[PDB]
Design an enzyme around this catalytic site. Structure first.
Site, PDB file in Angstrom:
ATOM      1  N   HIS A  77      -4.677  -7.850  -3.348  1.00  0.00           N
ATOM      2  CA  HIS A  77      -4.573  -6.833  -2.299  1.00  0.00           C
ATOM      3  C   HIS A  77      -4.903  -7.390  -0.912  1.00  0.00           C
ATOM      4  O   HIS A  77      -4.150  -7.249   0.029  1.00  0.00           O
ATOM      5  CB  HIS A  77      -5.493  -5.629  -2.590  1.00  0.00           C
ATOM      6  CG  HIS A  77      -5.415  -4.580  -1.542  1.00  0.00           C
ATOM      7  ND1 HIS A  77      -4.292  -3.785  -1.398  1.00  0.00           N
ATOM      8  CD2 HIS A  77      -6.275  -4.211  -0.557  1.00  0.00           C
ATOM      9  CE1 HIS A  77      -4.478  -2.961  -0.370  1.00  0.00           C
ATOM     10  NE2 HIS A  77      -5.674  -3.198   0.150  1.00  0.00           N
TER      11      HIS A  77
ATOM     12  N   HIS B 219      -1.094   4.695  -0.314  1.00  0.00           N
ATOM     13  CA  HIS B 219      -1.978   5.647   0.381  1.00  0.00           C
ATOM     14  C   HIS B 219      -1.509   7.076   0.270  1.00  0.00           C
ATOM     15  O   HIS B 219      -1.416   7.807   1.259  1.00  0.00           O
ATOM     16  CB  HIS B 219      -2.231   5.207   1.848  1.00  0.00           C
ATOM     17  CG  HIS B 219      -3.178   4.048   1.968  1.00  0.00           C
ATOM     18  ND1 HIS B 219      -4.473   4.120   1.484  1.00  0.00           N
ATOM     19  CD2 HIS B 219      -3.031   2.819   2.518  1.00  0.00           C
ATOM     20  CE1 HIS B 219      -5.064   2.951   1.724  1.00  0.00           C
ATOM     21  NE2 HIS B 219      -4.221   2.151   2.353  1.00  0.00           N
TER      22      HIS B 219
ATOM     23  N   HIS C 159      -2.521  -4.685   2.266  1.00  0.00           N
ATOM     24  CA  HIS C 159      -3.781  -4.324   2.956  1.00  0.00           C
ATOM     25  C   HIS C 159      -3.614  -4.077   4.444  1.00  0.00           C
ATOM     26  O   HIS C 159      -4.169  -3.117   4.948  1.00  0.00           O
ATOM     27  CB  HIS C 159      -4.834  -5.385   2.589  1.00  0.00           C
ATOM     28  CG  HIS C 159      -6.241  -5.155   3.084  1.00  0.00           C
ATOM     29  ND1 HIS C 159      -6.959  -3.980   2.938  1.00  0.00           N
ATOM     30  CD2 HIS C 159      -7.102  -6.062   3.619  1.00  0.00           C
ATOM     31  CE1 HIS C 159      -8.189  -4.173   3.412  1.00  0.00           C
ATOM     32  NE2 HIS C 159      -8.301  -5.430   3.816  1.00  0.00           N
TER      33      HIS C 159
ATOM     34  N   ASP D  30       0.831  -1.220   0.000  1.00  0.00           N
ATOM     35  CA  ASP D  30       0.000   0.000   0.000  1.00  0.00           C
ATOM     36  C   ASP D  30       0.857   1.258   0.000  1.00  0.00           C
ATOM     37  O   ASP D  30       1.930   1.307   0.629  1.00  0.00           O
ATOM     38  CB  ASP D  30      -0.851   0.042   1.269  1.00  0.00           C
ATOM     39  CG  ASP D  30      -1.800  -1.128   1.408  1.00  0.00           C
ATOM     40  OD1 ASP D  30      -1.462  -2.264   0.999  1.00  0.00           O
ATOM     41  OD2 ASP D  30      -2.871  -0.884   2.019  1.00  0.00           O
TER      42      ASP D  30
ATOM     43  N   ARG E  18     -13.231  -5.838  10.250  1.00  0.00           N
ATOM     44  CA  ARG E  18     -13.512  -4.669   9.422  1.00  0.00           C
ATOM     45  C   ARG E  18     -14.999  -4.547   9.130  1.00  0.00           C
ATOM     46  O   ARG E  18     -15.449  -3.543   8.594  1.00  0.00           O
ATOM     47  CB  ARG E  18     -12.796  -4.768   8.076  1.00  0.00           C
ATOM     48  CG  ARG E  18     -11.295  -4.887   8.153  1.00  0.00           C
ATOM     49  CD  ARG E  18     -10.727  -5.201   6.761  1.00  0.00           C
ATOM     50  NE  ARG E  18      -9.304  -5.492   6.825  1.00  0.00           N
ATOM     51  CZ  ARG E  18      -8.358  -4.563   6.718  1.00  0.00           C
ATOM     52  NH1 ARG E  18      -8.690  -3.280   6.555  1.00  0.00           N
ATOM     53  NH2 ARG E  18      -7.078  -4.915   6.758  1.00  0.00           N
TER      54      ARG E  18
ATOM     55  N   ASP F  40      -4.345   0.169  -3.304  1.00  0.00           N
ATOM     56  CA  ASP F  40      -4.402   1.202  -2.249  1.00  0.00           C
ATOM     57  C   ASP F  40      -3.372   2.271  -2.512  1.00  0.00           C
ATOM     58  O   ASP F  40      -2.504   2.596  -1.686  1.00  0.00           O
ATOM     59  CB  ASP F  40      -4.298   0.630  -0.821  1.00  0.00           C
ATOM     60  CG  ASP F  40      -5.617   0.030  -0.344  1.00  0.00           C
ATOM     61  OD1 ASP F  40      -6.574  -0.107  -1.125  1.00  0.00           O
ATOM     62  OD2 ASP F  40      -5.656  -0.294   0.878  1.00  0.00           O
TER      63      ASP F  40
ATOM     64  N   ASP G  87      -6.125   7.714  -0.905  1.00  0.00           N
ATOM     65  CA  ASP G  87      -6.727   7.916   0.436  1.00  0.00           C
ATOM     66  C   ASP G  87      -5.665   7.996   1.529  1.00  0.00           C
ATOM     67  O   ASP G  87      -4.559   7.460   1.391  1.00  0.00           O
ATOM     68  CB  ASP G  87      -7.771   6.838   0.807  1.00  0.00           C
ATOM     69  CG  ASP G  87      -9.049   6.941   0.020  1.00  0.00           C
ATOM     70  OD1 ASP G  87      -9.390   8.017  -0.520  1.00  0.00           O
ATOM     71  OD2 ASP G  87      -9.766   5.900  -0.061  1.00  0.00           O
ATOM     72  N   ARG G  88      -6.030   8.707   2.603  1.00  0.00           N
ATOM     73  CA  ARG G  88      -5.288   8.884   3.868  1.00  0.00           C
ATOM     74  C   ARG G  88      -4.105   9.819   3.783  1.00  0.00           C
ATOM     75  O   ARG G  88      -3.956  10.719   4.631  1.00  0.00           O
ATOM     76  CB  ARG G  88      -4.912   7.557   4.493  1.00  0.00           C
ATOM     77  CG  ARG G  88      -6.163   6.673   4.687  1.00  0.00           C
ATOM     78  CD  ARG G  88      -6.131   5.937   5.996  1.00  0.00           C
ATOM     79  NE  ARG G  88      -7.313   5.094   6.177  1.00  0.00           N
ATOM     80  CZ  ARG G  88      -7.499   3.900   5.606  1.00  0.00           C
ATOM     81  NH1 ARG G  88      -6.600   3.391   4.768  1.00  0.00           N
ATOM     82  NH2 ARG G  88      -8.605   3.212   5.858  1.00  0.00           N
TER      83      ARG G  88
ATOM     84  N   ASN H   8      -8.815  -2.142  -2.159  1.00  0.00           N
ATOM     85  CA  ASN H   8     -10.168  -1.752  -1.739  1.00  0.00           C
ATOM     86  C   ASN H   8     -10.397  -0.253  -1.754  1.00  0.00           C
ATOM     87  O   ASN H   8     -11.550   0.174  -1.744  1.00  0.00           O
ATOM     88  CB  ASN H   8     -10.551  -2.377  -0.365  1.00  0.00           C
ATOM     89  CG  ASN H   8      -9.649  -1.948   0.744  1.00  0.00           C
ATOM     90  OD1 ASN H   8      -8.418  -2.070   0.621  1.00  0.00           O
ATOM     91  ND2 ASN H   8     -10.203  -1.478   1.859  1.00  0.00           N
ATOM     92  N   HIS H   9      -9.337   0.549  -1.752  1.00  0.00           N
ATOM     93  CA  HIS H   9      -9.526   1.994  -1.856  1.00  0.00           C
ATOM     94  C   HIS H   9      -9.678   2.510  -3.284  1.00  0.00           C
ATOM     95  O   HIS H   9     -10.008   3.694  -3.472  1.00  0.00           O
ATOM     96  CB  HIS H   9      -8.414   2.768  -1.125  1.00  0.00           C
ATOM     97  CG  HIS H   9      -8.571   2.686   0.350  1.00  0.00           C
ATOM     98  ND1 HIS H   9      -9.049   3.750   1.066  1.00  0.00           N
ATOM     99  CD2 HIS H   9      -8.411   1.666   1.218  1.00  0.00           C
ATOM    100  CE1 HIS H   9      -9.153   3.406   2.338  1.00  0.00           C
ATOM    101  NE2 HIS H   9      -8.787   2.141   2.455  1.00  0.00           N
TER     102      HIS H   9
END
Ligand SMILES: [Cl-]
Ligand SMILES: [Cl-]
Ligand SMILES: [Mn+2]
Ligand SMILES: [Mn+2]
Length: 293
Positions: free
Chosen positions: A167, A60, A242, A58, A215, A86, A89-90, A118-119
């Site tokens: 992922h 991010h 992940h 990831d 989750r 991923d 995001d973040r 998943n993002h």
């Protein structure tokens, strides 16, 4: 679409204070999305790749850490790459991150590969930063252009018939690789099922078989699920991402599975390292590591 000018501007900030933006034009970014989406649809949803290559987890939006990974591993196409998703995001610089990765996919489409995390999903990245970054720095129409591209990313890869990569992880619905090959694109990530699990599931040391994932999405799976899967499909290793892991990589089930996470100091909340896995010609795995700050 001037790919070399785009990549040059993205790379110009190397050595700057981590934070300096690269602002491509909206038409440039739209071009990156449209051309990369065509390439993703033209290649299989289950990639069949060859070693040697470098595999990253990831990112991010930690763009300056992406540049360090390329500085350590070799800028494309000096090494082949597979990323496990991923990208956004973040972090603070999702836009630079995904734009550099899409530009390299278009430049080197048979030597550079991106899987879906998943993002890479509109309803997730609505909440966790990418929508806000697109609205602030561009507009929401460009956010939708990115979604349309994300919806066509491949979902898994097998390296030399031996390393299965995705992922998230395995699925209780995954009986044949043909079930992955049959998935049609574009698609969103569903709230349950094979595609959800490949992007969301996690290994667990304390579960026997399949368990409920904390989750609130997908499942956990234990070591014997891993062993059974490898035996059934004549594989040697599952490589996934992940989950943040302190060392940047972590083995599971007597080294039958490895988790990679490539964003060190993850979103300022963790003191983890970020790792990139180097897979040599004989499938032996070693690591290049961004140690925590
Ligand atoms: Cl070119
Ligand atoms: Cl198990
Ligand atoms: Mn993640
Ligand atoms: Mn994830």
């Amino acid at each position: 679409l001037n790919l070399d000018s785009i990549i040059g501007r993205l790379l110009e900030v190397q050595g700057s204070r981590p934070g300096k933006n690269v602002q491509l034009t909206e038409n440039e970014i739209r071009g990156l999305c449209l051309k990369s989406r065509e390439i993703f649809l033209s290649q299989p949803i289950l990639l069949e790749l060859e070693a040697p290559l470098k595999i990253c987890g990831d990112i991010h939006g930690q763009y300056y850490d992406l540049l360090r990974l390329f500085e350590y591993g070799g800028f494309p196409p000096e090494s082949n790459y597979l990323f496990l998703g991923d990208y956004v995001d973040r972090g603070k610089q999702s836009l630079e991150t995904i734009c550099l990765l899409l530009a390299y996919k278009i430049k080197y489409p048979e030597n550079f590969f991106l899987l879906r995390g998943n993002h890479e999903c509109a309803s997730i990245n609505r909440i966790y930063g990418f929508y806000d970054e697109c609205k602030r720095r561009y507009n929401i129409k460009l956010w939708k252009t990115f979604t349309d591209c994300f919806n066509c990313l491949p979902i898994a890869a097998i390296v030399d018939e031996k390393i299965f990569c995705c992922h998230g992880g395995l699925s209780p619905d995954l009986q044949s690789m043909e079930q992955i090959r049959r998935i049609m694109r574009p698609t969103d990530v569903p709230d349950q099922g094979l595609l959800c699990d490949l992007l969301w599931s996690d290994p667990d040391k304390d579960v026997q078989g399949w368990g409920e994932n904390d989750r609130g999405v997908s499942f956990t799976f234990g070591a014997e699920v891993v062993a059974k899967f490898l035996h059934k499909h004549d594989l040697d290793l599952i490589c996934r991402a992940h989950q943040v892991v302190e060392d940047g990589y972590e083995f599971f089930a007597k080294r039958q599975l490895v988790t990679l996470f490539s964003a060190p100091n993850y979103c300022g909340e963790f003191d983890n390292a970020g790792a990139m896995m180097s897979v040599d010609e004989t499938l032996m795995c070693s690591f290049q590591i961004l140690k925590p700050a």
